[PDB]
Write an enzyme that holds these catalytic residues in place. Structure first.
Site, PDB file in Angstrom:
ATOM      1  N   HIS A 305       9.742   2.445   0.730  1.00 16.78           N
ATOM      2  CA  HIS A 305      11.108   1.197   0.838  1.00 16.78           C
ATOM      3  C   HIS A 305      11.712   1.422  -0.531  1.00 16.78           C
ATOM      4  CE1 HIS A 305      12.572  -3.320   2.523  1.00 16.78           C
ATOM      5  NE2 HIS A 305      13.440  -2.371   2.531  1.00 16.78           N
ATOM      6  N   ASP A 362       5.489  -4.892   5.392  1.00 19.61           N
ATOM      7  CA  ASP A 362       5.294  -4.711   6.466  1.00 19.61           C
ATOM      8  C   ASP A 362       3.979  -4.259   6.726  1.00 19.61           C
ATOM      9  OD1 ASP A 362       8.166  -5.458   7.814  1.00 19.61           O
ATOM     10  OD2 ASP A 362       8.773  -3.857   6.181  1.00 19.61           O
TER      11      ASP A 362
END
Ligand SMILES: NC(=O)C1=CN([C@@H]2O[C@H](COP(=O)(O)OP(=O)(O)OC[C@H]3O[C@@H](n4cnc5c(N)ncnc54)[C@H](O)[C@@H]3O)[C@@H](O)[C@H]2O)C=CC1
Ligand SMILES: NC(=O)C1=CN([C@@H]2O[C@H](COP(=O)(O)OP(=O)(O)OC[C@H]3O[C@@H](n4cnc5c(N)ncnc54)[C@H](O)[C@@H]3O)[C@@H](O)[C@H]2O)C=CC1
Ligand SMILES: NC(=O)C1=CN([C@@H]2O[C@H](COP(=O)(O)OP(=O)(O)OC[C@H]3O[C@@H](n4cnc5c(N)ncnc54)[C@H](O)[C@@H]3O)[C@@H](O)[C@H]2O)C=CC1
Lengths: 426, 426, 142
Positions: A305, A362
């Site tokens: 990320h 996620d």
């Protein structure tokens, strides 16, 4: 207290500029009136340009710090619910008992969608993607809700904002039901935001559906961890769109299309190519497929990320909650033990440690959603549904600042004026 | 050409900033490194920030210049035709007859849309404003055209371009036929782009429709004149949403919504309030209503424009066009004698002279369309319908450059890390 | 011999021969060809069956679906024992089949259905129903 004073830009003479300061993070150089002199700055992507002053969410990538109205993400993700977190993002403060109950109530009483909207689902294809259809219904809402488009009216903006926090789950669940072929389920005002959602997703007339308390809580936390995430692309798409004065719905529809941009934007076989190579090289029970797949690594699979340096501060609770869920569904999730090997690889395999492919929110949110019997296709939908409250807050905060219409400049390197002479005849 | 080399920023350490130059317009200070050096600017509205490098359109607001690939908008509208401009914008060079044949045949070859998509119109209320239906339709295309969503496959972009370019006027004329209870008209390969749109817009199964060449060219001109307009609000939304992987069908939908935002976003009666006071103070045949209306003036009414100072270059060939249309329709336009009065007002009223509310391309387009019979609800659908190529080109270019994801900064000014303690209990 | 028929005859005459056992006189051919032609358009309600199938349904499956649904609509030619009923049940299928086949194709690709055209031949018409659109004049290559 260093350069909190001022600065100067020099081209061939001195130009003094202010340096506004934020309560958290980096301060900035006021260049607003620079254009009123012709002097412009070049910056594709604006990664070196503060697009606005916000107060909703604060982040510090390297420290792994995420804040929503100052309250740490880990505090909200555990001791609150989606609606209470929504109230905060939308109102800046944690609700009062009388405040929360009234906010909560209005949300539940507006969960149904007009019968004519429901009809629109029926003209979409069954094989369509729940997300592609989710976009279709979203950007289509303005055709019905013509009574709340005027963005400069606080009454409208609130009504519209409530029309979306109430109607997103309903909408989303229907995308799922229609994709599989089960009848649409009406919202139950007696169930919480999340329970009511699991019911609309998994209920069938054949028998009454009973929501597992741990699973209900687990979904509320998935929502909480996706509520907002500062100035990203899909939120900045809502802001850009809203600046022009575009209705809320179409703005919320833009974000959905921009949130799954990397999913389809990959390719018919981006993170799907090697998924087809799980039939010829299946001799090895892991490095076939999604252990060998990522040639062009993806943060969409739960590894990596751009925001944080070493880890996701949202992945903390999501991981704990992940265990409780799997530690509830028992003999149906033992086969989904790749979740720990994949995680094991993510923590020890060089390829991952190199690119810092850490398991984000996620990553675990997916294991839970998969554990719960939810189809992959409905994962960004649920994320877009949860992220809408954020897009609502951002869009709303932009409507107080001064609703500054995004009117950027461009470094023009094309052709200088040239006469036109068409040599055609058709 | 004084300092087209370098300059310096003084925060605490003299940072060398390279000055970049174009072929037209102003110079830009490359600050794409400031962020990393922990230096962020603050420009809500990107009024002093150049979002990218472009070679499509160039505007000189003070000198009234508008160029598409280096060619003046006048010549194009007078010498060229929409499709050739479509060719030029997207390709950067004018088409050879053979390349024109090729391109024209591709747009023609894909005008009829999927019949299932045609079933979407029938899910909207007959009373839905056409624009809303349009954003609805366009936001629903991705579900059906799932094989041209990989924003990274060059071949996918070519398809996504041609589809929109071919089916837009088709979806626009259907939004009109729908809102009036008249049957839809299929495209006709024998007809031109403009003449066909005219045919799809007006003809019925009851009588043979006559495509007036004067109207045919006029309509065409409206299209060339609304093709592109640099980095405005809608073109910004499209780019921003696009830099985030969003599929082409979604970017255009937000561009469409971004485009009519200023319309509904005014008030249910902003430029409509006095349009109601034409029954009580109708004693004076002008200063009642839309002569006394603008307490909060609008360029939506066709007056003025933030981009150009003294006049709008697109309005020059639009005014001339508007002269023949009215002189063609004759005894159906004598009542529409207010266009002159209104023009006179803008040219002489001290307030209009003062605040420069000159007539713009839309003033002259509105009259043309009004004379033609197309309702005001359709004006914006036709603006966006023409504007699509401008969105596609800008979208395309953004993907060839480097598709720099939209990730601007913010000046946080909310609470500092604070603890959360469940105030409520529900 | 199948060769001669395929080289000398045409589907409809073979249709005539198979069913009748003898080759058709010009007058009998006219009669038979006019009967197949006269009943190509199917009931509009049946046309509404195609619209209940998924756009992603394999054409053959849709065909068996359509053909298995005809009895509901053609309830007056179901007495397998009435000679007149057999004549109707023959002509219908013989006339409407290529019509239902070209509709199974237009459907699976999102293109509008094409109505039969009496001026066209059995093959040329099937070609027309199969490919033409409302957008351009279709050329039936001989
Ligand atoms: N605080 C407030 O007073 C709010 C009022 N509204 C109002 O809601 C009205 C229509 O809102 P939408 O739901 O978006 O209408 P809609 O046009 O989408 O129609 C949905 C219909 O179902 C009803 N409905 C929805 N959920 C329901 C539930 N749980 N129980 C009973 N009825 C339910 C609605 O009242 C409405 O008649 C507007 O006129 C708007 O002003 C919307 C938000 C907040
Ligand atoms: N430059 C190119 O080679 C392009 C090729 N395409 C290809 O062509 C196909 C066309 O897809 P869509 O048109 O979007 O299909 P669609 O099914 O979504 O919509 C229309 C259908 O009608 C047909 N059609 C459309 N306009 C027509 C016209 N004027 N005359 C006759 N038939 C017409 C199309 O072939 C198509 O099957 C794509 O799947 C793509 O493979 C699309 C764009 C450009
Ligand atoms: N050899 C014969 O005399 C036959 C007589 N029939 C009779 O003719 C009637 C026809 O029934 P269906 O065609 O199955 O009716 P239907 O209603 O099920 O389907 C088509 C309808 O469109 C009309 N139609 C079909 N193709 C046409 C064409 N090419 N041009 C103009 N109109 C056309 C038909 O007359 C009929 O009303 C039967 O009810 C039966 O009584 C049917 C077959 C053979």
């Amino acid at each position: 207290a260093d350069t909190k004073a001022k600065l100067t830009l020099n081209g061939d003479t001195a130009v003094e500029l202010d340096v506004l300061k934020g309560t958290l993070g980096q301060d900035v150089i006021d260049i607003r009136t620079l254009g009123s002199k012709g002097v412009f700055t070049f910056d594709p992507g604006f990664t070196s340009t503060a697009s606005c002053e916000s107060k909703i969410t604060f982040i510090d990538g390297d420290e792994g710090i995420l804040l929503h109205r100052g309250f740490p993400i880990d505090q909200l993700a555990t001791d609150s619910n989606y609606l209470e977190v929504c109230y905060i993002l939308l109102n800046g403060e944690k609700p009062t008992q009388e405040q929360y109950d009234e906010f909560k109530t209005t949300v539940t009483r507006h969960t149904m969608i007009h019968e004519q909207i429901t009809r629109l689902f029926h003209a979409f294809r069954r094989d369509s993607h729940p997300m592609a259809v989710m976009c279709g219904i979203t950007g289509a809402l303005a055709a019905f809700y013509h009574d709340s488009l005027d963005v400069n009216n606080p009454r409208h903006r609130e009504i519209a904002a409530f029309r979306l926090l109430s109607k997103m789950p309903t909408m989303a669940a229907m995308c799922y039901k229609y994709s599989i072929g089960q009848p649409f389920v009406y919202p139950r005002n007696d169930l919480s935001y999340a329970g009511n959602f699991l019911n609309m997703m998994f209920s069938t007339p054949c028998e009454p559906y009973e929501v597992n308390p741990i699973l209900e809580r687990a979904m509320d936390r998935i929502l909480i961890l996706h509520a907002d995430h500062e100035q990203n692309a899909s939120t900045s798409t809502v802001r850009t769109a809203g600046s022009s004065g575009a209705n809320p719905f179409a703005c919320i529809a833009a974000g959905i299309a921009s949130l799954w941009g990397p999913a389809h934007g990959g390719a018919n076989e981006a993170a799907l190519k090697m998924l087809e190579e799980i039939s010829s090289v299946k001799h090895i029970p892991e490095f076939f497929r999604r252990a060998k797949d990522k040639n062009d690594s993806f943060r969409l699979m739960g590894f990596g990320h751009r925001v944080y340096k070493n880890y996701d501060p949202r992945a903390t609770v999501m991981r704990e909650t992940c265990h409780e869920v799997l530690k509830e569904l028992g003999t149906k999730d033992d086969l989904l033990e790749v979740a720990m090997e994949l995680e094991n690889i993510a923590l020890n395999d060089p390829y991952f440690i190199e690119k810092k492919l850490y398991p984000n929110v996620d990553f675990y949110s997916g294991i839970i959603l998969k554990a719960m019997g939810i189809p992959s296709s409905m994962f960004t939908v649920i994320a877009a549904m949860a992220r809408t409250v954020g897009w609502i807050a951002h869009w709303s905060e932009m409507h107080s600042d001064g609703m500054k219409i995004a009117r950027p400049r461009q470094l023009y390197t094309g052709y200088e004026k040239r006469d036109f002479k068409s040599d055609i005849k058709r």
